[PDB]
C-alpha cells in the first residue's frame, strides 16, 4: 500500500539531481524510496560522492514513481541494452515515469518520450527533438503520466509538482515549509535568457564537447527506435 | 591537485542529507577543489531519510581545510555535546579561510562558540536558539558576518554555496555554476516561508516540532553553560 519510488543509481550519475528529488519525497508519508542500480552497493556520482544502490534491477518491487536522473553517466545507458529494458518493463505498469535533467534522455532512448511533450537541460535541448518528444521550454512539463523536469536543480520543483500529484497541494505545501523553500539566488544567472552574455558562452563551450558525443549517440538510439 | 581548495562537510548519523549533497554539487564544480567528508572514521553514515553516505576521514587524518561546513539535521543535538567534534571545529575554524553552515548546522557552531557576538540564521523553526549561544539573529537567506557564512533552512544551501562560490572565486564564476545547474526555481507553491505559507500549515508544522524545540532548548543551554565556564 505505501507508495513505491524508484531512482536508477547509475555511476557518473550528478548527484543533486536524485539527491534533491530524494529529500523531497521521502518527507511524506507512506513513501518507500529505492535506489536501483544493477547490483546493490557502491555507485560513484560524477562529483566523487559515493551513494549506495539499495536493490538491483531483480529485487526492485512494482514502482508507483520511476525517477531517472541526468548526469555524464546518460551516455553509456542511452546505449545499455539491460537498463533500457529494466526501464520499460517498470514503465509498463509504473503510475509516473518521470525524469529530472538529461534522465529524459535516457526515456528517450527507451522509447518513451515519442509523440510526447518533455523537457531537459537548457544546454541539450536540441536533442528532445530526434528522440521523438515534442520540445517544451518549461522547467516541469507534464504530458498524462509523464512529467520531466529541466536541468540539476529544477529536480527540487519537479518533486514538489509531483508530491502534490500523489498527495494533494497541503501536503506539498507541508513539505515545501519544512524545506525552507523559499529561493533567494545571489545571481540571476540561472537561465541563459537572463545570464550575461559572456557566462551564456562560457557555459556553451564547456558543455561543447559533451554536446558533441551526445549528438553522435541521439542520433544511433533514434535509429535503433525506427529500424 | 596538491594546491587544491580544501572545502570539509561534517557527515554524521542523522544529517538531512540534502544539506550536505546541495552544497557538495554546487561546490564540487569548481575549479581545482577537494572536498571531504568526515567523521570519527571513514565509513558509511546514514542519514535521516535512510541514505547512505561515505565518509572519507577521520577527524585525526583530515588536512587543514580552507573552508568547514556543518549540516544539519536530526543528529544535531548529539553533536552540540560531543567534546570530539566541537574540538575539531574549533581547531579547524582557527585557520580556516571561512566557517560555514547551513540549517541548524549554525547551532554546532554555536556550541563550539563561534557564534559569540556574531550575525547568523538557521532554519526559521529552530531561529530563537540562537540568541543563547551568543549569537545576534538574522532572518535572512544567507548571513555573513566576517568570514562566517551561514544559510537558512535546508534548501537554503543552495543559495548559500553560490555565495560562497563567488568569495572563493568571483562573480562570473558562480554565475557560471548557476547556469550550469539551471538555478532558475520556479516552486509551484508559495509554501517555503512561515511568513507566505497558508497560516494552516504554519501551524501544523510548530505543532509537529514543538518537541524538538523543547528538548533542543534544554541542550543549547546546557552547551552555552559550558561556554559560560
Sequence with gaps: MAVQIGFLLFPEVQQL????????????????????????????????????????????????????????????????????????????????????????????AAGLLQGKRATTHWAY???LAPLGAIPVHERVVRDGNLLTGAGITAGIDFALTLAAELFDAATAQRVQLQLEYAPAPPFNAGSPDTAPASVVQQARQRAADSLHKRREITLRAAARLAA
Excluded at 31 to 37: A, D, G, P, R, S
Excluded at 52 to 73: E, N, R, W, Y
Design 17 to 108: 539531481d536524485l539527491t534533491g528529488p530524494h529529500d523531497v519525497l521521502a518527507s511524506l508519508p507512506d513513501v518507500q524510496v529505492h535506489l536501483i542500480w544493477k547490483e546493490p552497493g557502491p555507485v560513484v556520482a560524477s562529483s566523487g560522492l559515493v551513494l549506495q544502490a539499495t536493490t538491483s534491477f531483480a529485487d526492485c518491487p512494482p514502482l508507483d514513481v520511476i525517477c531517472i536522473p541526468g548526469g555524464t553517466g546518460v551516455g553509456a545507458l542511452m546505449e545499455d541494452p539491460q537498463a533500457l529494458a529494466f526501464i520499460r518493463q517498470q514503465a509498463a505498469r509504473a503510475r509516473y515515469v518521470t525524469s529530472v535533467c538529461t534522465g529524459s534522455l535516457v526515456l528517450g
Design 125 to 127: 535541448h536540441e536533442l
